[PDB]
Amino acid sequence: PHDRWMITYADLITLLLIFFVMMYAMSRLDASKY
Amino acid sequence: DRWMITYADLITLLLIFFVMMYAMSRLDASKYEEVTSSLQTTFQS
Amino acid sequence: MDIATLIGLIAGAVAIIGGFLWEGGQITGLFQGTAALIVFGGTIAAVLISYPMHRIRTLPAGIKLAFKPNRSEVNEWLEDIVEMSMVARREGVLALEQKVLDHPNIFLREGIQLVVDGTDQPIVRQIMELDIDAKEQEHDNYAKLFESAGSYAPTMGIIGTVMGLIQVLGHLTDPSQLGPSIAVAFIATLYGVASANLIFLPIASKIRAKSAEEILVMEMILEGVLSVQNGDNALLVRKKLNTYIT
Amino acid sequence: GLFQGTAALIVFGGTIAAVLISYPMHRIRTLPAGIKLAFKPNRSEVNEWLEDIVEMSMVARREGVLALEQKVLDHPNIFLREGIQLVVDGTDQPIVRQIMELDIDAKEQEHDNYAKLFESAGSYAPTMGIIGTVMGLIQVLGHLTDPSQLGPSIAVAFIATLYGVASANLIFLPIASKIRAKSAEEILVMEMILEGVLSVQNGDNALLVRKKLNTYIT
Amino acid sequence: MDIATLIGLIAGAVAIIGGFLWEGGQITGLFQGTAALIVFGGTIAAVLISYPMHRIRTLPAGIKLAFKPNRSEVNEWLEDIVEMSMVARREGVLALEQKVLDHPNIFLREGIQLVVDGTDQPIVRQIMELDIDAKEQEHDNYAKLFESAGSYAPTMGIIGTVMGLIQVLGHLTDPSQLGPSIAVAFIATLYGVASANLIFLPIASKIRAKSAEEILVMEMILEGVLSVQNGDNALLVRKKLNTYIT
Amino acid sequence: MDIATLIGLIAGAVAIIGGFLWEGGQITGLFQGTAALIVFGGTIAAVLISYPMHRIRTLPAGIKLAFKPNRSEVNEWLEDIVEMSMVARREGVLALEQKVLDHPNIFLREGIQLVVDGTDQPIVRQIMELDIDAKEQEHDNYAKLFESAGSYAPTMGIIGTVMGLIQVLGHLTDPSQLGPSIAVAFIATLYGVASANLIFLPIASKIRAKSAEEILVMEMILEGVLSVQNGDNALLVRKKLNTYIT
Amino acid sequence: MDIATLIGLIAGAVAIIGGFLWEGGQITGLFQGTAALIVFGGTIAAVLISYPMHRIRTLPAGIKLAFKPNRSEVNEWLEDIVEMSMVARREGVLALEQKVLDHPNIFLREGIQLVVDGTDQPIVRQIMELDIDAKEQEHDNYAKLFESAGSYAPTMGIIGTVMGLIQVLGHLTDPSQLGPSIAVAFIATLYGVASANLIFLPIASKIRAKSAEEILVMEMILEGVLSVQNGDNALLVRKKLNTYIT
Ligand SMILES: CCCCCCCCCCC(CCCCCCCCCC)(CO[C@@H]1O[C@H](CO)[C@@H](O[C@H]2O[C@H](CO)[C@@H](O)[C@H](O)[C@H]2O)[C@H](O)[C@@H]1O)CO[C@@H]1O[C@H](CO)[C@@H](O[C@H]2O[C@H](CO)[C@@H](O)[C@H](O)[C@H]2O)[C@H](O)[C@H]1O
């Protein structure tokens, strides 16, 4: 298949997104307690 | 398969969004406003 | 510019730009020099590497086929062939020469010349069919340039997005200069998908539609010329040829 | 999350724009009839009024078909009525099949052309959904001042994607499918009429017409 | 070198490099040695494992077809076939043996030899079509090497990125200086997608386009040889062969 | 082993390991027990569920077809069929039996046996084409096992990483080691993608390449036996068969 | 039920669970209620919406085909057809009728009945092929249910991540809530990919493999019956039918 790379790339990006959306969320929470 | 090449693009956009949201949250109100306003100029009027 | 394409472009611009301005926006936002250079520059590069230079000179002629008005003369000829069928009846096939001596349609003019010369039915069929196949192949080749540009354009968008992600991560340590770079990602997506699905992949579809109309006209002139050789009575010819017209 | 104004004007407006650029105006004006065939009554009556045609098989050959032309003035259907006029003195077997057979190919092409408008619309619509969403996200990149909207504003942007995917799959591809399926049924009824006209030339066996016609009915 | 490929490569470099630089990045940020070694080294490895050795030696010939300057000689040959046909009709077929000995087109030479040896028309068609099919298969095999290289190159870009993230996230003890580190990892993805889309899949596409042009020249010499055997009048031969030329 | 596969494995190891060491690392940091067991174990499980047990016993023979050297004996047989042509012409068909009895190629031996038994030309074509179709199907079935192993392997990498990350979500409280912990989790995806792209899909592609070479040789034997039954002359036999050899 | 599936399930369970427990997991940590309900409940819902209810009753029959043990009967039917062909050479067709009257294979019995009735050879082919394509269509319809379940299950994983992302953006009052919320994202992803890749797509693949074996047995019986109609000698029949078996 030509476009077999996108399957893995969409999986890696998704994992990365979860990491920042988790950090962002922590940054607001820390700023609230500070 | 257009969906894959799009759902790949669309998901990447969201990551770029939050990478920006995280970085801004590590900044004070002063520098926050300069960036927050600066952008607010190009995509609103 | 055909009427359908002019109304289609007006609807396209009003939908996209009107949507943005209505929810609140400024149109100066949707132009991004760098995004245009990645998406359009990349698409131009991929198409030029993909095709020999002579094909690219045909690209103008492809647009001329897509947007020519429908001044169809199919009805005119449906009369012409039927007439010539009668003349062949009440006069020698030799007479056909003067009736077709000059005609706007070369295909018809030649086809009849091969019948005047007295050539056999399977060979006259084969030469006429070779001309039809050559016309179909020419029109397919025009369409393929537009289809191919439509394929590369979204993939150039995802290259532009990856360049956007690289630049935005580069600025995490000092988050004070991300205004321009943030857009180059979003607007490169927008140009990729919008150009592919509103300009290129449509113009491909219109080229294939209008080639099919012209090929059906040639198929009629073929069935008309073979009927003129056979010497059918006019009512049978008129019934058959009409089945081609809609 | 209802009738987002901007989403509709960008999914439906953009789909209409892409279809109008894609097809010449003469094709676009046929959309009316496409809907008519896609939503129309079962109308299998001809398949069951085959007996009407088979009544003709014995009767047409039993006595002169000279009265047949006035007899079939009634429209069981045009293809049938026109075929009888040809089956009347003047047609060799190959030519009468050929002229009638060509009508069948012309009608198959006509119905396919209707379906192709809906198939292509269902191919542009999902992508236009994406254009809507990206413009939504660009507008959020503008108004980044507040910290609660960062939730709901992204959600509404995605409503533009849904209006696409949903319109394409439910409205457009079912209308295409129902046009093409009922076209195939109507073409079979043509093939029934063709076997009727050929058997009218061939002989005068009412039961034998029954045998041939029955094969086409399924 | 071929002018459309050369302008396409210039446009491709300007799109990617100019697109990066215009928003204030650096060529030293873009040019990464380890990412180049993993994407290009990995692609070369996957293609070598994927094919027998003899096919890899065909790669030289594949590029030579893709960039062949089109000094068309097709028109020259059509004259040769037409004049040969009128010699065959007047003089008798033996004259072709005297004439067609020095001819640079081996496929035409063998076609004429088969007619001189008096072989039957279906046998001549069969043997000539086997030679056309052999050339079609050869050109497909060249294209398949580039299509397969273009498939592996993006996946090697993913390997280079995930290996980059392993190194960076490994030596992170806290969320500082992570942004620049992760950015460089994505350069490997950029080389994978960008090399595949501009260089590899275009060169595959161009090989297939120029193959199809060469096959049409052979198919014409097929109708030329069969019409020489049939002994048609020169005007009719000239008509048929012209349908192939553009 | 095939020389191209040996050089491909050397280039692949140097690219991936050399890339990782150049950006900075230890090879002992790129090995994980649990990640290998999830990725390879999961791939093996999905393949065993996917196929009947008898197919998996063919898997040994699949590798033997891929990695075998190119014996390249085609030229020898092309001579023999030519020689059989000459024997058949002078001696009559009975001599073909005595010539063929001890030929190392079974497919040729059976083809000649059908011609000496005097079977009519469509029947000998039919039976021999059924043998070719059976060998095409057999080789495709070997390749499909490796193609399907290559499609499960990356997804098993994703299962691996998500299992790693679930364990880490129990230690989010310590911010210092979260970073190194995530890196180890990613190792599985590096295996999933790397094994699919270097090992599994290349073995599939090499099976399909070598199958095509062998099927050509079979098709030549088919044109050879039909040519000797027709009673072509030696020069014409050689010319037809030569179209197959490269 | 079947040996390759049984060993595949054992290997899959050992790989995934053993990998998790080796790096210090607990098996209760993989279970989550809401993730199970979104992925499994959503897959079941999507199948029930998308297919009419009679198709769902075929799901039982689909599994029955997929895990059917290996049947050796093709060898026996080859011997039967050869014996019948030997009777057809020696004896009146009535001997076939009486021999096959109570034969266990319905398709073979009906083919012979048509040859005894002396029905036209292209009609015998046509009616037999209509039964073959009807059987092929039935098996394809079972496979498509499992392929659709394999498509829906990953999309329910995406919905699970969306629910996780909403909770973590929406509601935190202490960082401890982070892990118990983002847990839903990861665990829903794991069930989506793992259920699709091990359970659903393997069962689809195995249905298609077993269908192809059954269709080859039908095709062999068709070529046997047409050989009996042509009146071929037993040794030639033996050769043709044997090509289908491996
Ligand atoms: C590619 C993605 C992989 C990257 C690696 C992953 C994370 C990388 C590090 C990010 C991160 C951990 C991640 C947390 C959730 C995200 C999980 C993602 C993984 C998902 C699978 C660590 O970041 C820490 O917090 C700040 C972030 O910069 C920073 O603060 C300093 O520098 C500033 C600079 O501007 C500057 O203002 C100033 O000098 C500081 O404010 C600290 O120096 C830094 O160590 C987020 O920080 C969070 O900080 C919390 C308070 O400590 C901490 O709370 C826990 O511990 C507390 C005391 O221990 C305790 O009181 C809490 O009760 C407890 O709850 C969190 O647990 C978490 O640690």
Coordinates of C-alpha atoms in Angstrom, one line a residue, chain F:
Chain F
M1 CA 21.4 -16.2 0.6
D2 CA 20.8 -13.7 -2.2
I3 CA 23.6 -11.1 -2.4
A4 CA 21.1 -8.2 -2.6
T5 CA 19.5 -9.4 0.7
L6 CA 22.9 -9.6 2.4
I7 CA 24.0 -6.1 1.3
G8 CA 20.5 -4.8 2.2
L9 CA 20.8 -6.2 5.8
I10 CA 24.3 -4.7 6.2
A11 CA 23.1 -1.3 4.9
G12 CA 19.9 -1.5 7.1
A13 CA 21.8 -2.2 10.3
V14 CA 24.4 0.5 9.5
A15 CA 21.7 3.1 8.8
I16 CA 19.5 2.4 11.9
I17 CA 22.2 1.6 14.5
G18 CA 24.7 4.2 13.0
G19 CA 22.0 6.9 13.1
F20 CA 21.1 6.2 16.7
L21 CA 24.8 6.2 17.8
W22 CA 25.6 9.4 15.9
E23 CA 22.9 11.4 17.6
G24 CA 24.1 9.8 20.8
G25 CA 23.2 6.6 22.7
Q26 CA 24.0 3.0 23.6
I27 CA 22.7 0.0 21.7
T28 CA 21.8 -1.6 25.1
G29 CA 19.3 1.3 25.4
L30 CA 17.5 0.1 22.3
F31 CA 16.8 -3.5 23.5
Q32 CA 13.6 -4.4 25.5
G33 CA 12.4 -7.9 26.4
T34 CA 8.8 -7.1 27.0
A35 CA 8.5 -4.9 23.9
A36 CA 9.9 -7.7 21.7
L37 CA 7.5 -10.3 23.3
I38 CA 4.4 -8.1 22.8
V39 CA 5.3 -7.1 19.1
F40 CA 6.5 -10.5 17.8
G41 CA 4.2 -12.5 20.0
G42 CA 1.2 -10.4 19.0
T43 CA 2.1 -10.6 15.3
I44 CA 2.5 -14.4 15.4
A45 CA -0.9 -14.7 17.2
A46 CA -2.7 -12.6 14.6
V47 CA -1.2 -14.7 11.8
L48 CA -2.1 -18.0 13.4
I49 CA -5.7 -16.9 13.9
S50 CA -5.8 -15.6 10.3
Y51 CA -4.8 -18.8 8.4
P52 CA -5.5 -22.5 8.5
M53 CA -2.6 -24.6 9.9
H54 CA -1.7 -26.1 6.5
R55 CA -0.8 -22.6 5.2
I56 CA 1.7 -22.1 8.0
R57 CA 3.6 -25.3 7.0
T58 CA 4.0 -23.7 3.6
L59 CA 5.8 -20.8 5.3
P60 CA 9.2 -22.7 5.3
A61 CA 8.9 -23.2 1.6
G62 CA 8.1 -19.4 1.2
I63 CA 11.5 -18.4 2.5
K64 CA 13.2 -20.9 0.3
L65 CA 11.6 -19.4 -2.8
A66 CA 12.6 -15.9 -1.8
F67 CA 16.2 -16.3 -0.8
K68 CA 17.3 -19.0 -3.2
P69 CA 20.0 -17.9 -5.7
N70 CA 19.1 -17.4 -9.4
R71 CA 20.0 -20.7 -11.0
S72 CA 19.3 -19.1 -14.4
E73 CA 19.0 -22.3 -16.5
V74 CA 16.4 -20.8 -18.9
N75 CA 18.9 -20.5 -21.8
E76 CA 19.6 -24.3 -21.7
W77 CA 16.0 -25.2 -22.2
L78 CA 15.5 -22.7 -25.0
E79 CA 18.1 -24.7 -26.9
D80 CA 16.5 -28.0 -26.2
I81 CA 13.0 -27.0 -27.4
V82 CA 14.7 -25.8 -30.6
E83 CA 16.5 -29.1 -30.9
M84 CA 13.3 -31.0 -30.3
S85 CA 11.8 -28.9 -33.1
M86 CA 14.5 -30.3 -35.5
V87 CA 14.0 -33.9 -34.3
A88 CA 10.2 -33.6 -34.6
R89 CA 10.6 -32.3 -38.2
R90 CA 12.8 -35.1 -39.6
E91 CA 12.0 -38.1 -37.4
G92 CA 8.3 -37.7 -36.6
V93 CA 6.6 -37.5 -33.2
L94 CA 7.7 -40.9 -31.9
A95 CA 11.3 -39.6 -31.6
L96 CA 10.1 -36.8 -29.3
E97 CA 9.2 -39.5 -26.7
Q98 CA 12.7 -41.0 -26.8
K99 CA 14.3 -37.6 -26.7
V100 CA 12.3 -36.3 -23.7
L101 CA 12.3 -39.4 -21.3
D102 CA 15.1 -38.2 -19.1
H103 CA 14.7 -34.4 -19.1
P104 CA 15.1 -32.6 -15.7
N105 CA 12.1 -30.3 -16.3
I106 CA 8.8 -32.0 -15.5
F107 CA 6.6 -29.3 -17.0
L108 CA 8.4 -29.7 -20.4
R109 CA 8.3 -33.5 -20.2
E110 CA 4.5 -33.5 -19.6
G111 CA 3.9 -31.0 -22.4
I112 CA 5.8 -33.2 -24.9
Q113 CA 4.0 -36.3 -23.6
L114 CA 0.6 -34.6 -24.5
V115 CA 1.9 -33.8 -28.0
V116 CA 3.2 -37.3 -28.7
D117 CA -0.2 -38.7 -27.5
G118 CA -1.6 -36.6 -30.3
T119 CA -3.9 -34.4 -28.3
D120 CA -5.5 -31.5 -30.2
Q121 CA -4.0 -28.0 -29.8
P122 CA -6.7 -26.4 -27.6
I123 CA -6.6 -29.3 -25.2
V124 CA -2.8 -29.2 -24.7
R125 CA -3.0 -25.4 -24.3
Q126 CA -5.8 -25.9 -21.7
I127 CA -4.1 -28.5 -19.5
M128 CA -0.7 -26.6 -19.5
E129 CA -2.3 -23.3 -18.7
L130 CA -4.0 -24.9 -15.7
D131 CA -0.6 -26.0 -14.4
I132 CA 0.7 -22.4 -14.8
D133 CA -2.4 -21.0 -13.0
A134 CA -1.8 -23.5 -10.1
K135 CA 1.8 -22.3 -9.7
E136 CA 0.7 -18.6 -9.8
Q137 CA -1.8 -19.3 -7.0
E138 CA 0.7 -21.3 -4.9
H139 CA 3.3 -18.5 -4.9
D140 CA 0.7 -15.8 -4.2
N141 CA -0.4 -17.8 -1.1
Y142 CA 3.2 -17.7 0.3
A143 CA 3.5 -14.0 -0.3
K144 CA 0.2 -13.3 1.4
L145 CA 1.4 -14.7 4.8
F146 CA 4.3 -12.2 4.8
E147 CA 2.1 -9.3 3.7
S148 CA -0.4 -10.0 6.5
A149 CA 2.4 -10.3 9.1
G150 CA 3.6 -6.9 7.9
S151 CA 0.1 -5.3 8.4
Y152 CA -0.4 -6.6 12.0
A153 CA 3.1 -5.8 13.2
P154 CA 2.8 -2.0 13.4
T155 CA -0.6 -2.2 15.3
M156 CA 1.0 -4.6 17.8
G157 CA 3.6 -1.9 18.4
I158 CA 0.8 0.5 19.3
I159 CA -0.7 -2.1 21.7
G160 CA 2.8 -2.4 23.2
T161 CA 3.2 1.4 23.8
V162 CA -0.2 1.9 25.2
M163 CA 0.4 -0.9 27.7
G164 CA 3.7 0.8 28.7
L165 CA 1.9 4.2 29.1
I166 CA -0.8 2.7 31.3
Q167 CA 1.8 1.5 33.8
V168 CA 3.4 5.0 33.8
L169 CA 0.1 6.7 34.6
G170 CA 0.6 5.0 38.0
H171 CA 3.8 7.0 38.7
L172 CA 2.8 10.5 37.4
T173 CA 3.5 11.9 40.9
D174 CA 7.3 11.7 40.4
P175 CA 8.0 14.3 37.6
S176 CA 11.8 13.5 37.3
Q177 CA 11.5 10.0 35.8
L178 CA 8.3 10.4 33.7
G179 CA 10.4 11.4 30.8
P180 CA 12.8 8.4 30.7
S181 CA 9.8 6.1 31.4
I182 CA 7.9 7.3 28.3
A183 CA 11.0 6.6 26.1
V184 CA 11.1 2.9 27.1
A185 CA 7.5 2.6 26.2
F186 CA 8.1 3.9 22.7
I187 CA 10.5 1.1 21.9
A188 CA 7.6 -1.2 20.9
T189 CA 6.5 1.1 18.2
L190 CA 10.1 1.2 16.8
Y191 CA 9.9 -2.6 16.6
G192 CA 6.5 -2.7 15.1
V193 CA 7.3 -0.3 12.3
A194 CA 10.9 -1.4 11.8
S195 CA 10.1 -5.2 11.6
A196 CA 7.2 -4.6 9.2
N197 CA 9.1 -2.3 6.8
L198 CA 12.5 -4.0 6.8
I199 CA 11.8 -7.7 7.4
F200 CA 8.2 -8.6 6.6
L201 CA 7.2 -6.5 3.6
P202 CA 10.6 -7.0 1.8
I203 CA 10.3 -10.8 2.1
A204 CA 6.8 -10.6 0.6
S205 CA 8.1 -8.3 -2.3
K206 CA 11.0 -10.7 -3.0
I207 CA 8.7 -13.7 -3.2
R208 CA 6.5 -11.9 -5.7
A209 CA 9.5 -10.8 -7.8
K210 CA 11.0 -14.3 -8.0
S211 CA 7.6 -15.9 -8.7
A212 CA 7.2 -13.6 -11.8
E213 CA 10.6 -14.8 -13.2
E214 CA 9.6 -18.5 -12.8
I215 CA 6.2 -18.0 -14.4
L216 CA 7.9 -16.5 -17.5
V217 CA 10.0 -19.6 -17.9
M218 CA 6.9 -21.7 -17.6
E219 CA 5.1 -19.6 -20.3
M220 CA 8.1 -20.0 -22.6
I221 CA 7.8 -23.8 -22.3
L222 CA 4.2 -23.4 -23.2
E223 CA 5.0 -21.5 -26.4
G224 CA 7.8 -24.0 -27.1
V225 CA 5.5 -27.0 -27.0
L226 CA 2.8 -25.4 -29.0
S227 CA 5.4 -24.3 -31.6
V228 CA 6.8 -27.8 -32.0
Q229 CA 3.2 -29.2 -32.4
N230 CA 2.5 -26.5 -35.1
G231 CA 5.7 -27.5 -36.9
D232 CA 7.4 -24.1 -37.1
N233 CA 10.9 -23.9 -38.5
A234 CA 13.9 -23.6 -36.1
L235 CA 14.5 -19.9 -36.9
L236 CA 10.9 -18.9 -36.2
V237 CA 10.9 -21.1 -33.0
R238 CA 14.1 -19.3 -31.8
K239 CA 12.6 -15.9 -32.5
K240 CA 9.3 -16.5 -30.5
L241 CA 11.1 -18.0 -27.5
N242 CA 13.7 -15.2 -27.5
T243 CA 10.9 -12.7 -26.7
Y244 CA 10.8 -14.2 -23.2
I245 CA 14.5 -14.3 -22.2
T246 CA 15.8 -10.9 -21.2

